Amino acid sequence: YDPRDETLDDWFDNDLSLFPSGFGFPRSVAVPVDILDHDNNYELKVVVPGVKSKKDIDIEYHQNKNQILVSGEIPSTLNEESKDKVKVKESSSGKFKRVITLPDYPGVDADNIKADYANGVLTLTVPKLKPQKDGKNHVKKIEVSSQESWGN
Amino acid sequence: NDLSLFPSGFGFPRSVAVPVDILDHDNNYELKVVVPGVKSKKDIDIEYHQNKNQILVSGEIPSTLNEESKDKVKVKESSSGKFKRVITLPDYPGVDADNIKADYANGVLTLTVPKL
Amino acid sequence: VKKIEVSSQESWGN
Amino acid sequence: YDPRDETLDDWFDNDLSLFPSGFGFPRSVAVPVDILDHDNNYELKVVVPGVKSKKDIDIEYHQNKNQILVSGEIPSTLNEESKDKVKVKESSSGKFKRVITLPDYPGVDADNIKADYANGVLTLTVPKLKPQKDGKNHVKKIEVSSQESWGN
Amino acid sequence: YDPRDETLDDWFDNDLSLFPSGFGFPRSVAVPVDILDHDNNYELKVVVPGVKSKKDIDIEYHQNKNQILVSGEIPSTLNEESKDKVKVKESSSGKFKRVITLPDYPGVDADNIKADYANGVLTLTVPKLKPQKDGKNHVKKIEVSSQESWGN
């Protein structure tokens, strides 16, 4: 993936999931998403960045892009008497956008899309009735023959 | 306007950089740290010093492993590990050291140090 | 047709 | 090569258990050190490769620094008539000292120090039967409510 | 020289100065070992780095290869809840294994070896009856051709 550091640290017992390559997800503010791949359902958990609201986060799907579009506003403060700071490093943006292309393979279903907000994290449980065929190769032709028990 | 304008005339020494916002409202010391997706509020300890009279917070956001409900393809995952918030309060005796309350809600940890 | 979601609340802890 | 998990595992192929922590540390001139922490009693083990009698080691408490005076010497095998000094290698540490720095708050005991000698291992337990300088001892009060069961 | 160990090594001139022969039997966990060579006994002090155990360390002789074998584990610390590691660095390898090719001449009888552990050091004394004939030569030969001083 990367030259050294971020290729090897992707396995279990301290952070990450296996991550060879990757395609860009257009967004403001970069925060990971877990994809639980199944053919009976599909998971999208978008870690919302400590937003106290959740009713100002609009979740919608483009059937014109095949992408899940979630937008929201990151908390911000304005200089006031009853606000007085000693330290500040709060975010670096006041608005957050994620544009997510699903690598779920042709057979997408999201028009039945349902959402939940759990633990300060937006979780979208995406119904799937497809694909069971017609992925990369039209009608799956996975290894099922070897002319023996496994071949030797 | 995502942080705010604040000239440096105060500062409390600290290690590890995470999004923070010290807030002083009435007479309390309050801090908003971005810690979302932390399962249980007992994975973050909020310890108030009885030998310094100061707040001290540490936490850890659960770390992603290799999963049997996820097929690994090209999907990134990340979290922040162990971290410590070293906040010093030169607020002096006259502050209640037994009435500190922390409010972890919506992925936002809100602290209150009364000073009733 | 454009679809929207509006799932919110559940602010009682878990 | 840089798996923080395997880095810590490689550290823990030298002691075979769970996880480390951080406390103290200032020292000048390296000697064997094993810093293990109980409830508030702290443990120090300095390996000796055998020593002639137990009168070659002194244990006291620094009354002017709030430190612990641990000092010893292990004699060298010398004037051997059994076999000439032309083959074999022997090394035994000379005059070593250990300066133990504890920023552990007032309530340390300087008379209840116990040093145990057995199996050629220096065993040191420093009480610490009172961590706090406050009236309540061993008490740090934490969060008790948050108006939600966890947070979401 | 300038190092303490080096000037100590130079101070082992008690009938000749001691410096490395140019060989040393396999070592895991660097700790020296002492041999005293004789044909009436062979005295071997395996310097042990402070093992708490004394039933888990094994001593065996191989009469087929004529190698004395001593091996065991270094007992490492644990992290539990009344054991909380900070930093430690003893027990660099958990397994130590001692093979020695005896340079005490053939005729050694190490089936009469005695083992005892005390002070933090393993002490092994191998009593000898042979060598005294049928050792390196069958009935020893000493050159007695000498004198003839009167000029020529």
From Swiss-Prot, chains A, D, E:
Gene Ontology terms: biological process: cellular response to heat; protein folding
GO molecular function terms attached to this record: identical protein binding; mRNA binding; unfolded protein binding
Residues the record lists as Phosphoserine modifications: S28, S146, S149
Location of region: Disordered: 130-152
Keywords per UniProt: Acetylation, Phosphoprotein, Stress response
Induction trigger: By heat shock, and under other conditions of stress, such as increased salt concentration and starvation.
Quaternary structure note: Present in large complexes.
Extra information: Present with 19300 molecules/cell in log phase SD medium.
Functional note: Not known. One of the major polypeptides produced on heat shock.
Similarity comment: Belongs to the small heat shock protein (HSP20) family.
Record-given protein name: Heat shock protein 26
Organism: Saccharomyces cerevisiae (strain ATCC 204508 / S288c) (Baker's yeast)
Shown chain mapped onto the complete sequence: 63 to 214 of 214
